[PDB]
Design a protein around this ligand. Sequence first.
Ligand code: HEM
Ligand SMILES: [N+]
Length: 184
Amino acid sequence: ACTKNAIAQTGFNKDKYFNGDVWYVTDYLDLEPDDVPKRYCAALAAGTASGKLKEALYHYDPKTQDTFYDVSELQVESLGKYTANFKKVDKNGNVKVAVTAGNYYTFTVMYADDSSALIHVCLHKGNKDLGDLYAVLNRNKDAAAGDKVKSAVSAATLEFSKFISTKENNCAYDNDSLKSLLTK
Ligand code: HEM
Ligand SMILES: [N+]
């Protein structure tokens, strides 16, 4: 189960974050021992499509090759805090698993600037018992975490040294699919 009420960034700039561009996960911290492997790659695009706040997701496990995309319409809880009812889709937006009761995530944007972000995610999916996840994002898939985002990790009373990097997984992303999924 999740245990954190993450606090959103003071002065969060939603239009800059939700600009339709891609964010790559560079580092992550899963609070429950084994909800996820020590290497999925992940990326997302977030934006407004025909007036609707949307987020598209990509996951890839470079060892198993397990791959999946999702798209969600987002609902607002407060500035920087959103609820996402996800649908599993192929890379072209064709539905594989419809929106389902019990299938949603919340996320909180704890820190963001033009190039980097720190988010909290609480995923709910069927009968899995999942815990809190934190992720450091960058607009550049190769960027080492800089001082603004690392300081934000500290300010959340977390230790960046505990975060697991995705950089040695050598993941390659279909950015075009993420951006186009925002409309689907
Ligand atoms: C970027 C922020 C992330 C968000 C919003 C997110 C969200 C989600 C969602 C919605 C699902 C279920 C998708 C579906 O069933 O259609 C999922 C599954 C999963 N995610 Fe993430 N995720 C993120 C990052 C990560 C990271 C960095 C990892 C690293 C290991 C990870 C590991 C997993 C795993 C292992 C599953 C499979 C869960 C299961 O079915 O048991 N996710 N995630
Ligand atoms: N996840």
